[PDB]
Amino acid sequence: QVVIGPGDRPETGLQGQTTIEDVVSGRSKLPYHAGVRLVGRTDIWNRGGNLQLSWVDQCAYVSTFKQAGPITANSRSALFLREPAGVAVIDVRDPRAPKPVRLLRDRGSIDAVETMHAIAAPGRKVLVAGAYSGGIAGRGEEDAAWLSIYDASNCLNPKLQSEFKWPANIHMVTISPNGRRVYGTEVVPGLGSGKGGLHVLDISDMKRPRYLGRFGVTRPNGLTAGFTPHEVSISHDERRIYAAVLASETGDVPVGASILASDGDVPVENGSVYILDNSDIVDGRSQPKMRLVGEAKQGGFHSVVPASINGVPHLVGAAELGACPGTWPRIINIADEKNPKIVGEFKLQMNIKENCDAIRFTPRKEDPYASFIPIPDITARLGAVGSHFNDVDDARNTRLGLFPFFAGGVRIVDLRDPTKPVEVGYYKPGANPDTPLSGNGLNWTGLNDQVTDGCMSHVRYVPESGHIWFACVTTGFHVVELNPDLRARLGFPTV
Amino acid sequence: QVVIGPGDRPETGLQGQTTIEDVVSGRSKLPYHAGVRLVGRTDIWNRGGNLQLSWVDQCAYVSTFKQAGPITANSRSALFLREPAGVAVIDVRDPRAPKPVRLLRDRGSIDAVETMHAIAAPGRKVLVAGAYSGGIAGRGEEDAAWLSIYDASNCLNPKLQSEFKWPANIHMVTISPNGRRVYGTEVVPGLGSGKGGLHVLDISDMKRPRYLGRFGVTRPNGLTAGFTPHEVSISHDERRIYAAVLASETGDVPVGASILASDGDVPVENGSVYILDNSDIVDGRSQPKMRLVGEAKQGGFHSVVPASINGVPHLVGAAELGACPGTWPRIINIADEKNPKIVGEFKLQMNIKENCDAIRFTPRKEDPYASFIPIPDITARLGAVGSHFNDVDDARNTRLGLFPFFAGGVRIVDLRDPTKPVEVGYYKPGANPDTPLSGNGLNWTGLNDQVTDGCMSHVRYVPESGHIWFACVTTGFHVVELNPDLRARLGFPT
Ligand SMILES: [Mn+2]
Ligand SMILES: [Mn+2]
Ligand SMILES: [Mn+2]
Ligand SMILES: [Mn+2]
Hints:
Chain B: Keywords: Hydrolase, Metal-binding. Chain B: Mn(2+) 2 binds at residues 114, 302, 320, 388. Chain B: Mn(2+) 1 binds at residues 114, 171, 230. Two copies of one chain form a homodimer. By secondary structure, chain A is mainly beta. Chain A has one domain (1-495). In chain A, 4% of the residues lie in helices and 35% in strands. The first copy, chain A, has a five-stranded antiparallel β-sheet with strand order 1-28-27-26-25, with no helix packed on it. The first copy, chain A, is globular. The two termini of chain A are 24 Å apart. One manganese (II) ion binds at residues 114, 302, 320, 388 of chain B.
């Protein structure tokens, strides 16, 4: 549970709510927080349009996304791709004063969106960023699915090593723990049909990457079918792949409503989590397969990450966004990987339907224009309160969930009881209106940049310092820490 | 066609288009115009949220609408109804410097939206404003459909005479030419079912108004059926009512997509225009009926106004807004009122489907999320280019259509050939971001107040001066005039 101490600037409505009162008074433009303290922040040249966060050592990388739209060709988007667009390199050697140092604006890094990852492996420091909108059928070379691969041995000055062109649109990338492979998801155009897969790129030689192939899911009957994974995480020894899956070509993963719909009938589906045996690739077997070991239905289509809670292996999975009551993370016990089981769920008060109905300025029932001219309630013109990524503090020794909830800001969750996750803290960064990459009312995500902000990035926990790193669309890159009281309570070590 | 000459600041893209290049460069925040010049303007305490324009003599009345939403109870919306919300009284005695003088904030005027009209009749000047959102079933008395009635004998200081409670939601009001009756449309909750009607209120004593009843449409078969008129206009002798009609209970009238749908294929349908014989009410017959004289299919559901073009009686009707390719006015010949005939259409290039397609950043066929996660093209994030009201310069001697096109600004159209209306001028006011009534990204109309403005009001032409009055959502009240060149070519007096 969350205790309010003198340090805090707590939420003024329901848990996770941005109240219309605060929007009108201007209060919503300033931060809210409990259980945490801001260490440092940079608005990254006041740019806006921030999305993904990756890191190598003491350097953060923050991608950008264009208002022109998720799938719009980069060649048609020059008005939205000039500086300060691109992946910003941020010096965090002093976390009280993070400092943006340069912009990567190569084919993959100019509009990386969700398609960026970095890894510090033994003797290999790598940053990759890809053209999230690239490779859509019928376009030319300029608009292909480019992947820019950087040697980040000097993390403050990543050196472009090569640019590889995928044979399909790649949505998210995950570099293997040894830094020598990149796993790229294909969700488009298959989407709900499940006709996509997981691409593998060998980047042992960063200057000369070698395409491995497009993988489907292989079942015990020996047959392979497509799937459309959104993102994968990878086990420590690379022998397990944990896929968050939107759909299967076998058709047994139900697909639901648009996560950007404002209201309000059909629901968003959670999608499934697949655990995949990746031993074939690890051991260099010919005709390699990715074999289905187990499946957690409703496990979460958007992101899944590994966790170890009191010595017991778990996964944390979630869908994303969604109109009220939105979407939220689920805790999945994988002690038996052949039979994963959802053991707990973490939800805010704003993820309860009854609550969402109670705050509306007008009840759906009273709306004569309902089918005729659908108009969202004013409470739905702020931004979704639902997951967008769902990380943990330490995969190998997990206590805390670090859960971005988009307009709900970043939620800090005690996971020590996996059947009963509870909030212990949160940070909402306020607002930063009129930025170059998020201004002009041209946004497409439903985030209202005039009055609030949205946290959409992966979240880092640094055990040495206790610092938590995250990026928010308009306010930029933040470093926060737990307050002394909460830290003492969690019995985290102390330095 | 628009002669672009000195003093003009032309549109840069297709006719009616707000170009993404201009949004990004900031050019969209400044006015565009051809054929006209600005005489004067007031931003009305820089308030935003303006909608309807009415007038008496040298005073303008401008309504507001709240961000809380079209049908949200006023009692639940106090955060959106603080000053400067309300009907603003504007002194236009000096058109070069119109001045906001007063704010009317009674039950009907606090949030009037489209529901406001004023008339200057012999021995009577009257302004009425009604709670557009009032009278939804299951609410308290404070949230009823109130109509505030003002004696505007002194147009700068309208005096509240009474507040009348309609027995249903009333959407638009039209005062009769003699100033003695108010015609109020009921479109909610019936909407597409056609189950509504036309309410009539006697206001000959403004302090003691008397309800005359709710009327349907009576046909030759002797039956009366409901209809949902959005707005009516009335003939000079009140014996004819021209109704813009969304739907009929007889179901003959095509009802289509949402006017506010972002990016949809399915077009907004035009609805129908009904000509109604109103002689029963005029002559004071008991159990009065409104009898269908004629019907113009596709005539326009939103607004219809009379026009006289080279001595021949016409109507100009239109639907409203809508995604590309939007909605646009139609010219209707009613020389035979029993058989109204659409004879012309005024369309902008932005009302052509193939142009709408050509400006998209991404073609529909290239979007794999098209059904799965529908997302409007960036070109659809500015505001509809489609009619919102569709007036003429002088109903009795018509030369020009004065056509608000929302994000398209106000279009000035040569109607002298009713089969071939042609544009001769326009004014787009630019942008006025961060107003208290239109700011904070809380709009529901689809208007992007950060980079453009929306023209939604009725439009006044003053024959004596040549001045044209209109209101825009964020930029406020404007007075413009035709160029000397335009006036001469069109054959206007001097
Ligand atoms: Mn994605
Ligand atoms: Mn996402
Ligand atoms: Mn209306
Ligand atoms: Mn309207």
